[PDB]
């Protein structure tokens, strides 16, 4: 469907996604732990009934009818974790995730009260500006004709070389500022 590395979802991935969503919806509909455990064992037995199959078309519309049945028997209000999207606490503290580059706009009066941290930040900035050239040199040659086919990035190859395009992942803001 829409994945970063693969261009499609295989049959195994579809089955596992259906199993996980079915377990989540069954846990939502079966609030008490023991009823949920019993019906999870029943659902695992039902899934293992058709595990050993040799015809791909049979697995195809078996998965179609299973997804239709799961759509019919879903919870209208499924349980959502607080940090998951759609939850009550989703992307809340993202309002407080101030990016690091704003620290480059501070006054020298308020930069003098954190000397050591700003010295270490200067060292990190120097490391970034000396690693950018060799990281783009690494990414230029490794890229084949027509650009990269997948979104996966090559890792660090030579000793002393940082991975390409690493700044906006390593220096991303913390979860709890």
């Amino acid at each position: 469907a829409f994945l970063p590395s693969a261009a499609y979802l295989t049959h195994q991935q579809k089955v596992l996604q259906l199993y996980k969503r079915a377990l989540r919806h069954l846990e939502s509909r079966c609030v008490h732990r023991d009823k949920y455990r019993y019906f999870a064992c029943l659902l695992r037995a039902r899934f293992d009934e058709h595990k050993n199959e040799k015809d791909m078309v049979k697995a195809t519309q078996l998965l179609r009818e299973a997804e239709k049945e799961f759509w019919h028997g879903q919870h209208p209000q499924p349980y959502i974790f607080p940090e998951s999207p759609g939850g009550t606490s989703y992307e809340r503290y993202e309002c407080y995730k101030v990016p690091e580059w704003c620290l480059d706009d501070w006054h020298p009066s308020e930069k003098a009260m954190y000397p050591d941290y700003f010295a270490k930040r200067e060292q990190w900035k120097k490391l970034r500006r000396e690693s950018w050239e060799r990281e783009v040199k690494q990414l230029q040659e490794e890229t084949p004709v027509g650009g990269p086919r997948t979104e996966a990035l090559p890792p660090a190859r030579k000793q002393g070389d940082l991975p390409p395009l690493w700044w906006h992942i390593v220096t991303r803001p913390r979860e709890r500022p």
Binding site: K68, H72, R128, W132, G147, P148, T150
Partner: protein, 128 residues
């Protein structure tokens, strides 16, 4: 049995119920590979223009400028006056105006006729 999902303009079909997602033909495979390659090339261009230490400014997004110019300034050079546009302009451009004018003229004529015959309660109405 089950109640089959009937999609509408404000209720899209679920992605896992789509038959086209369950197609394993080769043409869908090359289409998915081609769109993945296009998306990977655009993503690579973005994070190349994004992680540059020398750059301190706005990374230009051509798609956003394209969308704004399509919405704002490219609507009149690609307009042809035909029967559909004329009918939609006559139904929506002057219809509400004449309807509102008629209902307000009727209401004001009724109010003036009631006032001039001395039946409307205007005893304490001294602010106008």
């Amino acid at each position: 049995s089950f109640p089959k999902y009937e999609p509408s303009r404000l209720a899209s079909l679920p992605t896992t119920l789509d038959p086209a997602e369950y197609d394993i033909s080769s043409e869908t495979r090359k289409a998915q590979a081609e769109r993945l390659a296009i998306r990977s090339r655009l993503k690579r261009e973005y994070q190349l223009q994004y992680n540059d230490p020398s750059r301190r400014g706005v990374v230009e997004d051509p798609a956003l400028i394209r969308w704004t110019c399509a919405r704002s300034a490219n609507v009149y050079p690609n307009f042809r006056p035909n029967t559909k546009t004329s009918l939609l302009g006559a139904l929506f451009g002057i219809g509400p105006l004449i309807f509102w004018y008629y209902v307000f003229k009727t209401d004001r004529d009724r109010k003036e006729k009631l006032i001039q015959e001395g039946k409307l309660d205007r005893t304490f109405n001294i602010s106008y």
